[PDB]
mmCIF file of all heavy atoms in Angstrom:
data_model
loop_
_atom_site.group_PDB
_atom_site.id
_atom_site.type_symbol
_atom_site.label_atom_id
_atom_site.label_comp_id
_atom_site.label_asym_id
_atom_site.label_seq_id
_atom_site.Cartn_x
_atom_site.Cartn_y
_atom_site.Cartn_z
ATOM 1 N N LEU J 1 0.187 -6.001 1.780
ATOM 2 C CA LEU J 1 1.414 -5.810 2.452
ATOM 3 C C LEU J 1 2.457 -6.874 2.080
ATOM 4 O O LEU J 1 3.614 -6.523 1.883
ATOM 5 C CB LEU J 1 1.181 -5.756 3.927
ATOM 6 C CG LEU J 1 2.485 -5.467 4.757
ATOM 7 C CD1 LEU J 1 3.263 -4.251 4.369
ATOM 8 C CD2 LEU J 1 2.163 -5.519 6.237
ATOM 9 N N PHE J 2 1.987 -8.147 2.043
ATOM 10 C CA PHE J 2 2.873 -9.234 1.589
ATOM 11 C C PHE J 2 3.429 -9.049 0.221
ATOM 12 O O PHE J 2 4.637 -9.224 0.006
ATOM 13 C CB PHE J 2 2.018 -10.571 1.649
ATOM 14 C CG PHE J 2 2.871 -11.790 1.521
ATOM 15 C CD1 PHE J 2 4.005 -12.101 2.200
ATOM 16 C CD2 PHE J 2 2.466 -12.773 0.539
ATOM 17 C CE1 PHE J 2 4.700 -13.219 2.075
ATOM 18 C CE2 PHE J 2 3.072 -13.992 0.374
ATOM 19 C CZ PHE J 2 4.333 -14.151 1.034
ATOM 20 N N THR J 3 2.583 -8.526 -0.684
ATOM 21 C CA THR J 3 3.090 -8.280 -2.066
ATOM 22 C C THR J 3 4.164 -7.270 -2.047
ATOM 23 O O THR J 3 5.192 -7.448 -2.771
ATOM 24 C CB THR J 3 1.881 -7.731 -2.838
ATOM 25 O OG1 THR J 3 0.858 -8.717 -2.984
ATOM 26 C CG2 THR J 3 2.234 -7.394 -4.244
ATOM 27 N N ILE J 4 4.091 -6.212 -1.299
ATOM 28 C CA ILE J 4 5.125 -5.156 -1.281
ATOM 29 C C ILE J 4 6.343 -5.797 -0.764
ATOM 30 O O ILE J 4 7.489 -5.654 -1.252
ATOM 31 C CB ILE J 4 4.714 -3.982 -0.351
ATOM 32 C CG1 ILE J 4 3.476 -3.313 -1.008
ATOM 33 C CG2 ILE J 4 5.872 -3.018 -0.260
ATOM 34 C CD1 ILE J 4 2.757 -2.290 -0.105
ATOM 35 N N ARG J 5 6.373 -6.488 0.342
ATOM 36 C CA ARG J 5 7.540 -7.159 0.895
ATOM 37 C C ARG J 5 8.169 -8.131 -0.065
ATOM 38 O O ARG J 5 9.412 -8.211 -0.144
ATOM 39 C CB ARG J 5 7.116 -7.895 2.207
ATOM 40 C CG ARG J 5 6.732 -6.891 3.313
ATOM 41 C CD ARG J 5 6.047 -7.551 4.422
ATOM 42 N NE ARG J 5 7.031 -8.532 5.117
ATOM 43 C CZ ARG J 5 7.741 -8.242 6.112
ATOM 44 N NH1 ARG J 5 7.954 -6.906 6.439
ATOM 45 N NH2 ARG J 5 8.109 -9.120 6.975
ATOM 46 N N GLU J 6 7.350 -8.897 -0.772
ATOM 47 C CA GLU J 6 7.941 -9.902 -1.685
ATOM 48 C C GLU J 6 8.542 -9.272 -2.924
ATOM 49 O O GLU J 6 9.496 -9.757 -3.393
ATOM 50 C CB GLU J 6 6.762 -10.839 -2.065
ATOM 51 C CG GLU J 6 6.301 -11.900 -0.905
ATOM 52 C CD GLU J 6 7.304 -13.036 -0.804
ATOM 53 O OE1 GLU J 6 7.396 -13.788 -1.793
ATOM 54 O OE2 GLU J 6 7.980 -13.007 0.209
ATOM 55 N N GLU J 7 7.902 -8.204 -3.315
ATOM 56 C CA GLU J 7 8.318 -7.656 -4.568
ATOM 57 C C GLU J 7 9.628 -6.784 -4.320
ATOM 58 O O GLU J 7 10.553 -6.787 -5.186
ATOM 59 C CB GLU J 7 7.202 -6.670 -5.198
ATOM 60 C CG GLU J 7 6.134 -7.527 -5.755
ATOM 61 C CD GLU J 7 6.435 -8.229 -7.059
ATOM 62 O OE1 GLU J 7 6.961 -7.543 -8.005
ATOM 63 O OE2 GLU J 7 6.042 -9.310 -7.239
ATOM 64 N N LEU J 8 9.650 -6.151 -3.257
ATOM 65 C CA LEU J 8 10.756 -5.158 -2.964
ATOM 66 C C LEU J 8 11.740 -5.449 -1.868
ATOM 67 O O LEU J 8 12.734 -4.845 -1.685
ATOM 68 C CB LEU J 8 10.145 -3.694 -2.721
ATOM 69 C CG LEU J 8 9.382 -3.094 -3.933
ATOM 70 C CD1 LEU J 8 8.610 -1.875 -3.538
ATOM 71 C CD2 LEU J 8 10.384 -2.777 -5.098
ATOM 72 N N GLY J 9 11.357 -6.406 -0.964
ATOM 73 C CA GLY J 9 12.096 -6.683 0.198
ATOM 74 C C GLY J 9 11.837 -5.746 1.376
ATOM 75 O O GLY J 9 10.785 -5.700 1.974
ATOM 76 N N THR J 10 12.916 -5.018 1.879
ATOM 77 C CA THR J 10 12.629 -4.224 3.027
ATOM 78 C C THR J 10 11.581 -3.068 2.882
ATOM 79 O O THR J 10 11.665 -2.338 1.814
ATOM 80 C CB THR J 10 13.934 -3.575 3.554
ATOM 81 O OG1 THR J 10 13.821 -3.166 4.835
ATOM 82 C CG2 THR J 10 14.404 -2.436 2.552
ATOM 83 N N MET J 11 10.811 -2.892 3.868
ATOM 84 C CA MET J 11 9.867 -1.748 3.822
ATOM 85 C C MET J 11 10.656 -0.394 4.046
ATOM 86 O O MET J 11 10.052 0.694 3.663
ATOM 87 C CB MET J 11 8.798 -1.872 4.931
ATOM 88 C CG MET J 11 7.997 -3.207 4.726
ATOM 89 S SD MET J 11 6.941 -3.238 3.252
ATOM 90 C CE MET J 11 6.061 -1.820 3.347
ATOM 91 N N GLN J 12 11.783 -0.329 4.679
ATOM 92 C CA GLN J 12 12.483 0.765 5.150
ATOM 93 C C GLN J 12 12.746 1.698 3.905
ATOM 94 O O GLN J 12 13.281 1.242 2.915
ATOM 95 C CB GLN J 12 13.685 0.519 5.913
ATOM 96 C CG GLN J 12 14.584 1.764 6.187
ATOM 97 C CD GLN J 12 15.642 1.524 7.270
ATOM 98 O OE1 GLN J 12 15.963 0.326 7.681
ATOM 99 N NE2 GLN J 12 16.130 2.653 7.884
ATOM 100 N N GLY J 13 12.253 2.964 3.902
ATOM 101 C CA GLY J 13 12.696 3.871 2.983
ATOM 102 C C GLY J 13 11.783 3.935 1.689
ATOM 103 O O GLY J 13 12.021 4.614 0.784
ATOM 104 N N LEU J 14 10.788 2.995 1.608
ATOM 105 C CA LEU J 14 9.905 3.016 0.513
ATOM 106 C C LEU J 14 9.004 4.217 0.466
ATOM 107 O O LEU J 14 8.442 4.598 1.448
ATOM 108 C CB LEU J 14 9.057 1.723 0.367
ATOM 109 C CG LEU J 14 9.771 0.309 0.273
ATOM 110 C CD1 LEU J 14 8.752 -0.812 0.272
ATOM 111 C CD2 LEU J 14 10.620 0.347 -1.024
ATOM 112 N N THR J 15 8.648 4.610 -0.826
ATOM 113 C CA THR J 15 7.617 5.609 -0.962
ATOM 114 C C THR J 15 6.465 4.905 -1.727
ATOM 115 O O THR J 15 6.600 4.273 -2.767
ATOM 116 C CB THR J 15 8.121 6.818 -1.916
ATOM 117 O OG1 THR J 15 9.057 7.604 -1.090
ATOM 118 C CG2 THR J 15 6.999 7.725 -2.190
ATOM 119 N N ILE J 16 5.251 4.970 -1.200
ATOM 120 C CA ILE J 16 4.029 4.373 -1.570
ATOM 121 C C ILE J 16 3.099 5.446 -2.061
ATOM 122 O O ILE J 16 2.831 6.419 -1.276
ATOM 123 C CB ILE J 16 3.346 3.541 -0.490
ATOM 124 C CG1 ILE J 16 4.460 2.528 -0.053
ATOM 125 C CG2 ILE J 16 2.130 2.912 -1.014
ATOM 126 C CD1 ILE J 16 4.212 1.866 1.219
ATOM 127 N N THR J 17 2.665 5.434 -3.273
ATOM 128 C CA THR J 17 1.831 6.367 -3.916
ATOM 129 C C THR J 17 0.422 5.693 -4.217
ATOM 130 O O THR J 17 0.272 4.775 -4.960
ATOM 131 C CB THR J 17 2.365 6.930 -5.160
ATOM 132 O OG1 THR J 17 3.543 7.461 -5.075
ATOM 133 C CG2 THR J 17 1.335 7.892 -5.843
ATOM 134 N N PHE J 18 -0.713 6.280 -3.509
ATOM 135 C CA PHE J 18 -2.029 5.711 -3.698
ATOM 136 C C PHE J 18 -2.634 6.592 -4.742
ATOM 137 O O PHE J 18 -2.509 7.974 -4.550
ATOM 138 C CB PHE J 18 -2.815 5.746 -2.358
ATOM 139 C CG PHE J 18 -2.300 4.783 -1.404
ATOM 140 C CD1 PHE J 18 -1.519 5.104 -0.241
ATOM 141 C CD2 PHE J 18 -2.501 3.410 -1.565
ATOM 142 C CE1 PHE J 18 -1.122 4.164 0.681
ATOM 143 C CE2 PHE J 18 -2.092 2.504 -0.646
ATOM 144 C CZ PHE J 18 -1.303 2.863 0.459
ATOM 145 N N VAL J 19 -3.352 6.105 -5.677
ATOM 146 C CA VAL J 19 -3.988 6.887 -6.777
ATOM 147 C C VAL J 19 -5.353 6.338 -7.001
ATOM 148 O O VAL J 19 -5.554 5.179 -7.254
ATOM 149 C CB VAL J 19 -3.056 6.899 -8.065
ATOM 150 C CG1 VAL J 19 -2.710 5.503 -8.439
ATOM 151 C CG2 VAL J 19 -3.930 7.514 -9.194
ATOM 152 N N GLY J 20 -6.306 7.310 -7.089
ATOM 153 C CA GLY J 20 -7.655 7.109 -7.545
ATOM 154 C C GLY J 20 -8.669 7.551 -6.500
ATOM 155 O O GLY J 20 -8.648 8.779 -6.192
ATOM 156 N N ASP J 21 -9.584 6.728 -6.050
ATOM 157 C CA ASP J 21 -10.625 7.034 -5.097
ATOM 158 C C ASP J 21 -10.138 6.648 -3.680
ATOM 159 O O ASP J 21 -10.067 5.401 -3.322
ATOM 160 C CB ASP J 21 -11.958 6.296 -5.517
ATOM 161 C CG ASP J 21 -13.034 6.666 -4.532
ATOM 162 O OD1 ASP J 21 -12.770 7.270 -3.485
ATOM 163 O OD2 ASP J 21 -14.174 6.299 -4.901
ATOM 164 N N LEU J 22 -9.507 7.580 -2.955
ATOM 165 C CA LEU J 22 -9.023 7.313 -1.645
ATOM 166 C C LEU J 22 -10.061 7.554 -0.587
ATOM 167 O O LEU J 22 -9.733 7.411 0.599
ATOM 168 C CB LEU J 22 -7.819 8.206 -1.477
ATOM 169 C CG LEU J 22 -6.752 8.167 -2.657
ATOM 170 C CD1 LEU J 22 -5.642 8.996 -2.252
ATOM 171 C CD2 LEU J 22 -6.338 6.780 -3.084
ATOM 172 N N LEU J 23 -11.236 7.868 -0.940
ATOM 173 C CA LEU J 23 -12.283 8.072 0.004
ATOM 174 C C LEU J 23 -13.122 6.700 0.201
ATOM 175 O O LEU J 23 -13.434 6.293 1.216
ATOM 176 C CB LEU J 23 -13.217 9.237 -0.356
ATOM 177 C CG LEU J 23 -14.485 9.433 0.440
ATOM 178 C CD1 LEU J 23 -14.055 9.738 1.990
ATOM 179 C CD2 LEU J 23 -15.240 10.588 -0.180
ATOM 180 N N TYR J 24 -13.606 6.237 -1.001
ATOM 181 C CA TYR J 24 -14.361 4.998 -0.933
ATOM 182 C C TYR J 24 -13.437 3.776 -1.199
ATOM 183 O O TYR J 24 -13.970 2.574 -0.954
ATOM 184 C CB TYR J 24 -15.375 4.965 -2.081
ATOM 185 C CG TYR J 24 -16.533 5.866 -1.854
ATOM 186 C CD1 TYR J 24 -16.336 7.256 -2.078
ATOM 187 C CD2 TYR J 24 -17.850 5.428 -1.593
ATOM 188 C CE1 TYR J 24 -17.487 8.149 -1.887
ATOM 189 C CE2 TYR J 24 -18.871 6.284 -1.415
ATOM 190 C CZ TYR J 24 -18.657 7.622 -1.584
ATOM 191 O OH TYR J 24 -19.743 8.551 -1.476
ATOM 192 N N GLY J 25 -12.209 3.937 -1.511
ATOM 193 C CA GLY J 25 -11.220 2.947 -1.636
ATOM 194 C C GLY J 25 -10.610 2.379 -0.326
ATOM 195 O O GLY J 25 -9.429 2.780 0.044
ATOM 196 N N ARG J 26 -11.545 1.775 0.507
ATOM 197 C CA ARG J 26 -11.107 1.327 1.833
ATOM 198 C C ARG J 26 -9.842 0.488 1.907
ATOM 199 O O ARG J 26 -9.189 0.366 2.932
ATOM 200 C CB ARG J 26 -12.338 0.737 2.601
ATOM 201 C CG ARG J 26 -13.044 1.837 3.409
ATOM 202 C CD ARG J 26 -13.725 2.873 2.459
ATOM 203 N NE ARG J 26 -14.933 2.411 1.770
ATOM 204 C CZ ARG J 26 -16.064 2.150 2.319
ATOM 205 N NH1 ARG J 26 -16.267 2.444 3.682
ATOM 206 N NH2 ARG J 26 -17.170 1.708 1.625
ATOM 207 N N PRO J 27 -9.604 -0.305 0.845
ATOM 208 C CA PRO J 27 -8.283 -1.083 0.967
ATOM 209 C C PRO J 27 -7.071 -0.162 1.153
ATOM 210 O O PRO J 27 -6.127 -0.605 1.910
ATOM 211 C CB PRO J 27 -8.219 -1.762 -0.306
ATOM 212 C CG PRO J 27 -9.635 -2.005 -0.619
ATOM 213 C CD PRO J 27 -10.333 -0.718 -0.335
ATOM 214 N N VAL J 28 -7.212 1.080 0.741
ATOM 215 C CA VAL J 28 -6.124 1.977 0.966
ATOM 216 C C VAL J 28 -5.942 2.313 2.539
ATOM 217 O O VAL J 28 -4.908 2.396 3.137
ATOM 218 C CB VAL J 28 -6.348 3.440 0.249
ATOM 219 C CG1 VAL J 28 -5.297 4.341 0.653
ATOM 220 C CG2 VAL J 28 -6.242 3.122 -1.321
ATOM 221 N N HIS J 29 -7.142 2.456 3.167
ATOM 222 C CA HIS J 29 -7.186 2.809 4.525
ATOM 223 C C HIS J 29 -6.687 1.606 5.441
ATOM 224 O O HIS J 29 -5.882 1.867 6.400
ATOM 225 C CB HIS J 29 -8.637 3.180 4.957
ATOM 226 C CG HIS J 29 -9.331 4.153 4.121
ATOM 227 N ND1 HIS J 29 -10.667 4.525 4.430
ATOM 228 C CD2 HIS J 29 -8.946 4.910 3.138
ATOM 229 C CE1 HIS J 29 -11.098 5.303 3.523
ATOM 230 N NE2 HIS J 29 -9.923 5.650 2.723
ATOM 231 N N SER J 30 -7.038 0.365 5.029
ATOM 232 C CA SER J 30 -6.518 -0.713 5.763
ATOM 233 C C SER J 30 -5.036 -0.829 5.588
ATOM 234 O O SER J 30 -4.356 -1.244 6.506
ATOM 235 C CB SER J 30 -7.211 -2.012 5.297
ATOM 236 O OG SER J 30 -8.625 -1.806 5.493
ATOM 237 N N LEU J 31 -4.446 -0.589 4.357
ATOM 238 C CA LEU J 31 -3.031 -0.760 4.176
ATOM 239 C C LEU J 31 -2.244 0.369 4.917
ATOM 240 O O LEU J 31 -1.287 0.165 5.497
ATOM 241 C CB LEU J 31 -2.831 -0.786 2.640
ATOM 242 C CG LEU J 31 -1.329 -0.986 2.252
ATOM 243 C CD1 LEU J 31 -0.720 -2.269 2.897
ATOM 244 C CD2 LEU J 31 -1.098 -1.084 0.717
#
């Protein structure tokens, strides 16, 4: 989450695309 804020600034209005294994990729679930 810090990386997103640092790279782009405001979270408002961002589109986040998760790609790959979204079942066993638990970092996706935490984010």
Side-chain angles (χ1 to χ4, degrees):
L1 181 57
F2 186 56
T3 294
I4 296 165
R5 296 169 59 94
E6 281 285 297
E7 290 286 311
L8 295 169
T10 196
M11 305 293 305
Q12 172 162 21
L14 298 177
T15 291
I16 302 163
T17 302
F18 292 107
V19 48
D21 184 345
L22 308 186
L23 174 60
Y24 289 74
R26 266 66 75 73
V28 175
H29 308 177
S30 299
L31 184 54

